[PDB]
Amino acid sequence: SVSARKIKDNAADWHNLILKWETLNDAGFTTANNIANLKISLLNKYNEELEKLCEELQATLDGLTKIQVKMEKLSSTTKGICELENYHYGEESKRPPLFHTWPTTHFYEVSHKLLEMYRKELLLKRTVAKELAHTGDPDLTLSYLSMWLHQPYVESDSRLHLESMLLETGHRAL
């Protein structure tokens, strides 16, 4: 009722963090599309509203950095409770599962691969926010906006994996 409640907290906090990542990504895409439209209206034809738009893009990136910090500490305490159970139950022990079937090392690998994917995607977003306001080739501008929108380091099947914890916690009805 202690470790299982930590799984109950961890799956719900995972789902809530994915929802706030999607809201911040929509705000960032609207600000970046306005930045590119202001740049092409500059070059086809100033620093205050361009600096203001770059500053709210920086505030969006700071919010995503805070979400990644909470992701890293959630995976770290999941690693800590799996190592605590592995130290407490000994080596040669056939452990019954906390829910019906799954052991806790599967939760550790799910959290590790989700953490790796979102950590790579945040670094690509920092490079896009570095290089967006200075470039002049419009194909590269469309490529940078497509890298913001389509998120090429976040894979689709990991959503299926998130729903596996939603059938290991029970927030969704069986």
Partner: peptide, 26 residues
């Protein structure tokens, strides 16, 4: 010193300051 030129962060390292009274540093 840290300045953000249009989103790009810059790292500046100060080597020498020469002031108004003519006294320089090392």
């Amino acid at each position: 010193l840290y300045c953000t030129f249009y989103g790009r962060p810059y790292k500046l390292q100060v080597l020498r300051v020469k002031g108004a009274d003519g006294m320089i540093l090392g």
